[PDB]
Design a protein around this ligand. Structure first.
Ligand SMILES: CC(C)(C)c1nc[nH]c1/C=c1\[nH]c(=O)/c(=C/c2cccc(C(=O)c3ccccc3)c2)[nH]c1=O
Ligand SMILES: Nc1nc2c(ncn2[C@@H]2O[C@H](COP(=O)(O)OP(=O)(O)OP(=O)(O)O)[C@@H](O)[C@H]2O)c(=O)[nH]1
Ligand SMILES: Nc1ncnc2c1ncn2[C@@H]1O[C@H](COP(=O)(O)OP(=O)(O)CP(=O)(O)O)[C@@H](O)[C@H]1O
Ligand SMILES: Nc1nc2c(ncn2[C@@H]2O[C@H](COP(=O)(O)OP(=O)(O)O)[C@@H](O)[C@H]2O)c(=O)[nH]1
Ligand SMILES: [Ca+2]
Ligand SMILES: [Ca+2]
Ligand SMILES: [Mg+2]
Ligand SMILES: [Mg+2]
Lengths: 309, 53, 424, 437
């Protein structure tokens, strides 16, 4: 009988983990401020990492990596990339970005501005890959689970969060064709349900239209970016040898251009899953992150590469 | 990485290495020790007054 | 702070009180005539806490024996360890108290109280550093209840800075001498709420049930009940009677057990309960001492929440295994331990075991579930008081109905106060 | 030279004093009776060890030590123990009745009846000094004496000796070896009242020492003897520059200059490597690189916290044994590129190194093995504020319900002193956040 606490009520992901844990008979939930927990499913802001790992006779685990915000806020992500030699200014998979405090097209963000006149100012991808029939933009979301040992587990199911409106070079003010978010769309669901193209269909399209695969044309670059990003920050956030342990689910957002090159847009620290995939992912978080640390009575692909030089 | 101000001797040595540059009075204490003794003595009086009733 | 003064009042007080001096005198290697015949120096190292040293190297208990009739005090002097007590400390009246609080507190006991206090002063005088007073009595009779609480009030007047602890045996219809016990107990509880630092609520209901249900004794005597009481009195005095690197007196223990001044009524327990060959394992002691069935106050700890817990393990065992087991019950039943007193369960181990058990555990629980005890006595009270039944015995000795109404109100306030922190 | 008076208050202070003075005697070759053969100037001197020891005409070397406890039993063991001849009876001061884990009882009630005696016994030592530096104060945050009486002493020492420095060695409370439930109250109260009177304070969380003893010494259930012998190694490391020839941390003022730029933030983290079991049959000796690297592992720190998420205002490496400057620089060079060592903008990113060639001395029949080389890193990092956050949280939980408060008020203290003291701590936590984020 292991114990947990739940300090983020909004979290759609860890609501399902809370439910899946309870429905085994071996995880009892406690009150939000009870200190005698094995597992903390914690808040987004000001999670008290200083209080973890100081309760004698309790192995304590939390579902956030302290320091991982340096990958997840846009301002600090840009600064991490320009400052770490393992990524560098000459980083082939990150758009050219600059920090100024509150083809020559850019995008401003942290209210989104796409222009040449005018937070972070980032190079806009003027010629993206466009799905057909539709002539329309998309972004790819990959879910990545980093466990207590710093194994980097990529979930096999990602999703293309599609635009329904044809892409337009001259008309920038119309946001529905340039910005590919789920909320901004809700032609909402003309080509696929809820503007979501899953990996089986998108592989098939690449095969049919371009005579290639998702694995070769795109996913190899995604696996390279995820691994390069997380191994960069490993020394700053790793909980190996530490008095408490951390795991975390990340949401990596990608853009594939016309020549089949993948670009990193943003990393997300408290990501939500797509409706269909909750049951499988949230079970996967329990098996690999939680049950590995607290044993009871593969959907992921492990990112490891040791090239010698 | 500059190794400055090296000083040596027979039992050891020391140096610096730079990787990169950039009260109340005796009155008030004796006063508030005694103010706590007033409250201590008033509380004891309230008890001995209660026990007298 | 080494010396404790012991006072035992009335029939019950002197009966369990005698059993205390029997058990600990064996534990310290003192024989029925007061002479030391032990072997370990640990038996004499803090012998001054409960014994004075006399000429010829005799040890004399720092004990005062109070009653309003001679019967029971004659029985103590005739009993096995009766000769060890200082004769001057036998202070007794003649007319008895007839199970009447008023007689004990206001008339008969008033006449005897000052001579008991002269003996208390006599013992307190020749005390290098007096840490406090301990008292044994019942709350259901007349002397131990009425006079014992009068003494407690007087002792507090003359020694207002010393710690006052009681073992207070609570009445129950299951083991009942007279119908007026709830009256006597209610009047006494109000005294204890005001004038003691710790009260160990020995409930005769619970002691009977342990003897009947869990010990298979069909017809339990007071000896069978008192056997369970003596094991617990030995248990709670272990950490003052011996070392082992624990630097605590009654005040220090009191400071750590009592978060609110009126809420100092503890729920004692003991493991194993006896009347054996296989020594218990540390997990068994731990689960038994936290089990409702082993509680000496007939309350269900699941009906309340623990403010603090203390537990004192006796015998040669692993301190690692103890820490682990104590942390196991806390971390697997954490709802019943208040989250607003961090680390409220504390533990000690003593190498010397008691006579007959290879290892034991005494449980001291300050739980809000003790309100059930006070609710039960309050219901028994009101059942009679609403018809003013049996009051003439008390109004005859000068008491007003007002004083009953007040005492009723003070005990229901105590109950409300416990209910407050059970929901906080 | 300039003299240093050590003051040991309460049980924790006294028993840690014992351990340190036992160790200091082995390090300087001073014996239980107090004779020091290697000392040739009989009856006096201005050697480095004389900062901690005075001398008599008969050749006795006597600690500049005062032991204070509100009850006799712990200091009684110093009067009858192996080092009984070492101390003059006037240095060992005891009351009859303790503070019962009550700050208010130690500060106000029982403090008042003994403070003037202690200051007098302190003045008897300060008058044997040609040039007093100041005071090393040893105590617990959790005890009533350790917390309560210490804060009163520290108030008075500022009045009577305003020109002098005051260093604390403070035992931060750990539930795993404490039977006191009210330590969060005592710790905040004494931290609040001692803060302006202490120039530099070294906190030692009993939790960390306890797990170092479990993990690295293979001790199943560590006693105070286990913990204290380890604590005194760390303390010796820290005080060695005051007792031996050298040029780093030569006086008490230099600890404040080197480690404490921002006066309120005067709690440096101590990290110590290597801790190795004497029962361990085969031990491969660790290098300058390996033990310097171990100074950035949380598992070797005196307080568990994460320096990575925080910023440094100062860092000092104190090595004992076979170490030379270039091995240290090579070790620091490797470590800068691997680990996350971020300094505050206004401070230089750098390390003050102190080496003493004498390897750590170990107490005979102790738990620690002899080692060729050891290090104690002293870093002023904002990460140590984690310990304040934990302590303040516990305080808030209890104090919200007024739990145990009546014991403090009953000894003369006012309820307002709780929230006043807690607000100082609230500001302290805020001061650490400004500096470190
Ligand atoms: C487990 C440990 C040591 C860490 C710990 N942590 C918190 N608490 C503890 C333990 C105790 N705490 C007490 O406050 C205590 C009070 C005590 C002691 C002796 C006697 C009588 C007493 O009323 C009496 C009266 C008449 C006849 C016989 C007995 C009370 N005993 C304990 O064993
Ligand atoms: N490291 C260490 N901690 C100790 C020692 N003795 C006590 N403690 C700790 O100190 C705290 C209790 O305070 P004490 O020093 O015993 O109390 P005191 O200062 O003697 O004051 P009172 O007993 O309240 O009069 C707890 O956190 C204990 O774990 C010791 O020898 N070493
Ligand atoms: N440099 C660029 N080139 C092309 N499109 C871009 C871009 N930067 C942002 N976008 C588009 O804007 C959309 C939203 O911007 P961005 O991903 O930076 O913030 P966001 O917060 O909306 C993602 P999430 O909420 O899923 O973490 C993306 O889906 C992407 O299609
Ligand atoms: N456990 C226990 N309870 C007793 C004993 N003697 C009496 N009682 C209880 O105490 C109450 C009677 O009080 P008693 O001590 O005889 O009266 P007193 O002599 O006038 O103080 C009743 O509730 C009895 O159940 C005893 O030896 N053991
Ligand atoms: Ca008469
Ligand atoms: Ca000399
Ligand atoms: Mg009777
Ligand atoms: Mg003490």
């Amino acid at each position: 009988m292991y114990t947990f606490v739940v300090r983020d009520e909004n979290s759609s992901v860890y609501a399902e983990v809370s439910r899946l844990l309870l429905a085994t008979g071996q995880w009892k939930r406690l009150r939000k401020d009870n200190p005698r927990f094995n597992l903390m499913l914690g808040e987004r802001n000001r999670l008290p990492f200083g209080r973890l790992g100081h309760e004698p006779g309790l192995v304590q685990l939390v579902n956030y990596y302290r320091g991982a915000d340096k990958l997840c806020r846009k301002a600090s992500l840009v600064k991490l990339i320009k400052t770490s030699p393992e990524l560098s200014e000459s980083c082939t998979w990150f758009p050219e970005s600059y920090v100024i405090y509150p083809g020559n097209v850019w995008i401003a963000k942290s209210g989104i501005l796409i222009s040449s006149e005018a937070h972070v100012i980032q190079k806009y991808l003027e010629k993206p890959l466009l799905l057909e029939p539709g002539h329309r933009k998309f972004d790819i979301r990959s879910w990545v689970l980093v466990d207590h040992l710093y194994n980097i587990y990529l979930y096999r199911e990602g999703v293309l969060r599609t635009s329904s409106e044809p892409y337009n070079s001259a008309n920038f003010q119309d946001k529905t064709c340039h910005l590919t978010n789920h909320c901004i769309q809700k032609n909402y669901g003309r080509y696929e349900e809820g503007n979501e193209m899953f990996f089986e269909e998108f592989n098939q399209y690449l095969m049919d239209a371009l005579n290639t695969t998702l694995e070769n044309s795109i996913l190899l670059q995604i696996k390279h970016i995820i691994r390069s990003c997380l191994m960069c920050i490993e020394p700053a956030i790793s909980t190996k040898h530490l008095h408490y342990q951390s795991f975390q689910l990340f949401g990596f957002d990608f853009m594939v251009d016309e020549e089949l090159k993948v670009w990193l847009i943003e990393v997300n620290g408290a990501p939500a899953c797509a409706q269909k995939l909750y049951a499988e992912l949230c079970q996967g978080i329990v098996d690999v992150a939680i049950s590995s640390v607290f044993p009871l009575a593969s959907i992921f692909i492990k990112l490891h590469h040791h090239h010698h030089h | 990485m500059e190794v400055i101000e090296l000083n040596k001797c027979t039992s050891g040595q020391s140096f610096e290495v730079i990787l990169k540059p950039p009260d109340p009075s005796l009155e008030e204490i004796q006063k508030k020790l005694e103010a706590a003794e007033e409250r201590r003595k008033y509380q004891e009086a309230e008890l001995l007054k209660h026990l007298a009733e | 702070m080494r010396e404790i003064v012991h006072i035992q009042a009335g029939q019950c007080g002197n009966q369990i009180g005698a059993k205390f001096w029997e058990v600990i005198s064996d534990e310290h290697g003192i024989d029925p005539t007061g002479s030391y015949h032990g072997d370990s120096d640990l038996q004499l190292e803090r012998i001054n806490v409960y014994y004075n040293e006399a000429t010829g190297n005799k040890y004399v208990p720092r004990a005062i024996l109070v009653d309003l009739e001679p019967g029971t005090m004659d029985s103590v002097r005739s009993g096995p360890f009766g000769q060890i007590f200082r004769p001057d400390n036998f202070v007794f009246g003649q007319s008895g108290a007839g199970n009447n609080w008023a007689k004990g507190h206001y008339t008969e006991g008033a006449e005897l109280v000052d001579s008991v206090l002269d003996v208390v002063r006599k013992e307190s005088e020749s005390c290098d550093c007096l840490q406090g007073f301990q008292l044994t009595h019942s709350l259901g009779g007349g002397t131990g209840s009425g006079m014992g609480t009068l003494l407690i009030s007087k002792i507090r007047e003359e020694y207002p800075d010393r710690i006052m602890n009681t073992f207070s045996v609570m009445p129950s219809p299951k083991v009942s001498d007279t119908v007026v016990e709830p009256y006597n107990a209610t009047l006494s509880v109000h005294q204890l709420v005001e004038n003691t630092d710790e009260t160990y609520c020995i409930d005769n209901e619970a002691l009977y049930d342990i003897c009947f249900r869990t010990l298979k004794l069909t017809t339990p005597t007071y000896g069978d009940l008192n056997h369970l009481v003596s094991a617990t009195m030995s248990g709670v005095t272990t950490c003052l009677r011996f070392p082992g690197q624990l630097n605590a007196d009654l005040r220090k223990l009191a400071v750590n057990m009592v978060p609110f001044p009126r809420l100092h009524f503890f729920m004692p327990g003991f493991a194993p309960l006896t009347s054996q060959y296989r020594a218990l394992t540390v997990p068994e002691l731990t689960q038994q001492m936290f089990d409702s069935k082993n509680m000496m106050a007939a309350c269900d700890p699941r009906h309340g929440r623990y403010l603090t817990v203390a537990a004192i393990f006796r015998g040669r065992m692993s301190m690692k295994e103890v820490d682990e087991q104590m942390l196991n019950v806390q971390n697997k039943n954490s709802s019943y331990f208040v989250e607003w007193i961090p680390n409220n369960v504390k533990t000690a181990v003593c190498d010397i075991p008691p006579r007959g058990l290879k290892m034991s555990a005494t449980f001291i629980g300050n739980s809000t579930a003790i309100q059930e005890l006070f609710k039960r006595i309050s219901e028994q009270f009101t059942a009679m008081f609403r018809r003013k039944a049996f009051l003439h015995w008390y109004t005859g000795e000068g008491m007003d109905e007002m004083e009953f109404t007040e005492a009723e109100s003070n005990m229901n306030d105590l109950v409300s106060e416990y209910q407050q922190y059970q929901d906080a | 030279m300039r003299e240093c008076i050590s003051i040991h208050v309460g049980q924790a202070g006294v028993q840690i004093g014992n351990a340190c003075w036992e160790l200091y005697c082995l390090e300087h070759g001073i014996q239980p009776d107090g004779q020091m053969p290697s000392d040739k100037t009989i009856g006096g001197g201005d050697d480095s060890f004389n900062t901690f020891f005075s001398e008599t005409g008969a050749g006795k070397h006597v600690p500049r030590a005062v032991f204070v406890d509100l009850e006799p039993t712990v200091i009684d063991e110093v009067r009858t123990g192996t080092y009984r001849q070492l101390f003059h009876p006037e240095q060992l001061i005891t009351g009859k009745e303790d503070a019962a884990n009550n700050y208010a009882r130690g500060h106000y009630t029982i403090g008042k009846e003994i403070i003037d005696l202690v200051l007098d016994r302190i003045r008897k030592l300060a008058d044997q000094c040609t040039g007093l530096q100041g005071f090393l104060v040893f105590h617990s945050f959790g005890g009533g004496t350790g917390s309560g009486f210490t804060s009163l002493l520290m108030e008075r020492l500022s009045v009577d000796y305003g020109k002098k420095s005051k260093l604390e060695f403070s035992i931060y409370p750990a539930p795993q070896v404490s039977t006191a439930v009210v330590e969060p109250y005592n710790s905040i109260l004494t931290t609040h009242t001692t803060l302006e009177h202490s120039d530099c304070a070294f906190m030692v969380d009993n939790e960390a020492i306890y797990d170092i003893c479990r993990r690295n010494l293979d001790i199943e259930r560590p006693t105070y003897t286990n913990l204290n012998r380890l604590i005194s190694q760390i303390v010796s490391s820290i005080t060695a520059s005051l007792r031996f020839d050298g040029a780093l941390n030569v006086d008490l003022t230099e600890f404040q200059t080197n480690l404490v730029p921002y006066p309120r933030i005067h709690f440096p983290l101590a990290t110590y490597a290597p801790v190795i079991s004497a029962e361990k049959a085969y031990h491969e000796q660790l290098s300058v690189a390996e033990i310097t690297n171990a100074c950035f592992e949380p598992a070797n720190q005196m307080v568990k916290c994460d320096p990575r998420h925080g910023k440094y205002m100062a860092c000092c490496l104190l090595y004992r044994g076979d170490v030379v400057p270039k091995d240290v620089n090579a070790a620091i060079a490797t470590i800068k590129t691997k680990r996350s060592i971020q300094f505050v903008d206004w401070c230089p990113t750098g390390f003050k190194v102190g080496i003493n060639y004498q390897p750590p001395t170990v107490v005979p029949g102790g738990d620690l093995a002899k080692v060729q080389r050891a290090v104690c890193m002293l870093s002023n990092t904002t990460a140590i504020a984690e310990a304040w956050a934990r302590l303040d949280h516990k305080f808030d939980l209890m104090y919200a319900k007024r739990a145990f408060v009546h014991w403090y008020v009953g000894e003369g203290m006012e309820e307002g002193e709780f929230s006043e003291a807690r607000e100082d701590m609230a500001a302290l936590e805020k001061d650490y956040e400004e500096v470190g984020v």
